[PDB]
């Protein structure tokens, strides 16, 4: 029954809610397990960046967020084509690709291809056989200059 | 203190393990200190109790310097029986009084190849520890 002034309240507790209650006592354990998995993956891919492939510069869709820019899923095939990278070699050398993304304007295209060229300049490539360096890189710049990168590769900044 | 997350400090769990231990680790539980002379001779401190070694009681009603040979290691009741450590019962017969092996000290070991091997193993581990902590 209502009592004097108050807010008309509509609790959604008519549907036997106590059979489905998700407690979070395993939240610290989940954080520990996720951290351990991250560290194990980083050890597994030793010189490769821990966060993973480089992501493209991507403008947010709606009118609320189109002033901001973030990281996308993968570089578009047009970007790779004008940057001179094969769409099947990009994933091997650590470049995320998104075959279903299009380039409506040219400014975003050019920004992403300068991003790709900068990444390619900063990339250190190890030869398949360390005793036989075919075309990857000089041993001088991969002996001590190789280091696992922490955080996103070339983080997207407004 | 204890840091290993796989050994428990729970009182109930430790008591359950102790009272339901099988005999092959009840033997380790029922260990006794060696005398000062034996501790000097063999670089070991404690030894599991054995059927035919001579001990002396250092606590309880039967304290003294008399040396008695063990005659029974009753592992089910966690006790041992010694030669003259006994009492008369009502009908005039003598019964051995069981006392805990941690309350005796071994003065002479019953030595065979297995006891000797355990003795050198313990001494070697102790020496390695001393050289590590030097």
């Amino acid at each position: 029954a209502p009592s004097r002034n108050g807010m008309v309240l509509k609790p959604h507790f008519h549907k036997d809610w106590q059979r489905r209650v998700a407690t979070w006592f395993n939240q610290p354990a989940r954080k520990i397990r996720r951290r351990k998995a991250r560290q194990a993956k980083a050890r597994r891919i030793a010189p490769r960046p821990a966060s993973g492939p480089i992501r493209p510069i991507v403008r947010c869709p709606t009118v609320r967020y189109h002033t901001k820019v973030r990281a996308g899923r993968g570089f578009s095939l047009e970007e790779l084509r004008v940057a001179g990278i094969h769409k099947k070699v990009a994933r091997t050398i650590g470049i995320s690709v998104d075959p279903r993304r299009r380039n409506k304007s040219t400014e975003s295209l050019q920004a992403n291809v300068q991003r790709l060229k900068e990444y390619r300049s900063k990339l250190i490539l190890f030869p398949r056989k360390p005793s036989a360096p075919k075309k990857g890189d000089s041993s001088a710049e991969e002996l001590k200059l190789a280091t696992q990168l922490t955080g996103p590769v070339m983080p997207v900044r407004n | 203190m204890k840091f290993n997350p796989f050994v428990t400090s729970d009182r109930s769990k430790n008591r359950k393990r102790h009272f339901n231990a099988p005999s092959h680790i009840r033997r380790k539980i029922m260990s006794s200190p060696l005398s000062k002379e034996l501790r000097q001779k063999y670089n070991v401190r404690s030894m599991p109790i054995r059927k035919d070694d001579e001990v002396q009681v250092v606590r309880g009603h039967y304290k003294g310097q008399q040396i008695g040979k063990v005659v029974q290691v009753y592992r089910k009741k966690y006790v041992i029986y010694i030669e003259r450590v006994q009492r008369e019962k009502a009908n005039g017969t003598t019964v051995h009084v069981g006392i805990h092996p941690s309350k005796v000290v071994i003065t002479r070991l019953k030595l065979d190849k297995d006891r000797k091997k355990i003795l050198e193993r313990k001494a070697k581990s102790r020496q390695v520890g001393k050289e590590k902590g030097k």
Binding site: V21, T23, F25 | R11
Partner: protein, 263 residues
């Protein structure tokens, strides 16, 4: 408690025309349990009233600014001899209460040299008090693994570990604390300020960068500054005895006028 506790009986009420209370009764026969009350908080073997549940909201979230404020208060109180004495930490021969030792202590390895350091710092009496206080707890904690209790000892605050934790940590009462990770639960153990703290020199120097001056914001917290006083001078005696206060006062009325018996 178990959500099934007291509710796995299939009992039902007998009705009203059988000269017994209308509580549900266990069905069947041939056992003591048959015809006994069930499901009620008043019934033996029944369900407790309002069974305890895991979603009690065990945790509380505290504002970060308030937590930092409490850390600052605990640190400020730890440098006042009256408050540490009132916590009972036996500081009577300590040369200086904001006790700061050289960074060599951070590299200690053995427990003997930690004991020697405490003895030379005249902080060994607090450890002896902890030893004297090691007794047996009263109640159910003995069956719930809180078997032993003891006095809280001093808090060694360090900047960098080079073996100091291993050198200490076998001394009862001694609690070690990283300066970058100060814990209010260790600085005010019972919620009372004034725990005896021994500082390493590098930790003592890092305190300014950790919490800032009133002129500098903290360089290691990126938005934090020391809180302000609402009373700059707390010396009530000197404030009241100051001549400018005294000139403004009326004369005291120090005569007691007790009731007059009406003759």
């Amino acid at each position: 408690v178990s959500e099934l506790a007291g509710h796995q009986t299939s009992a039902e009420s007998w009705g009203t025309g059988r000269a017994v209370a209308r509580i549900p009764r266990v069905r069947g026969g041939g056992t003591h349990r048959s015809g006994q009350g069930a499901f009620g908080n008043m019934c033996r073997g029944g369900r407790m009233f309002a069974p305890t549940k895991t979603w009690r909201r065990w945790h509380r979230r505290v504002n970060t600014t308030q937590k930092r404020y409490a850390i600052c208060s605990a640190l400020a109180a730890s440098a006042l001899p009256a408050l540490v004495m009132s916590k009972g930490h036996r500081i009577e021969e300590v040369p200086e209460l904001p006790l700061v030792v050289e960074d060599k202590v951070e590299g200690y390895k053995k427990t003997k040299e930690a004991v020697l350091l405490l003895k030379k710092l005249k902080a060994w009496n607090d450890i002896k008090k902890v030893y004297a206080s090691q007794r047996m707890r009263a109640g159910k904690g003995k069956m719930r693994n809180r078997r032993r209790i003891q006095r809280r000892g001093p808090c060694i605050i360090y900047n960098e570990d080079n073996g100091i934790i291993k050198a200490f940590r076998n001394i009862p009462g001694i609690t070690l604390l990283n300066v970058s990770k100060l814990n209010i639960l260790k600085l005010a153990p019972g919620g009372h300020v004034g725990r005896f703290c021994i500082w390493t020199e590098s930790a003592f120097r890092k305190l300014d960068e950790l919490y800032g001056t009133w002129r500098k914001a903290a360089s290691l917290k990126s938005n934090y500054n020391l809180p302000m006083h609402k009373m700059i001078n707390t010396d009530l005696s000197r404030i009241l005895k100051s001549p400018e206060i005294q000139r403004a006062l009326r004369a005291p009325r120090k005569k007691i006028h007790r009731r007059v018996l009406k003759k």
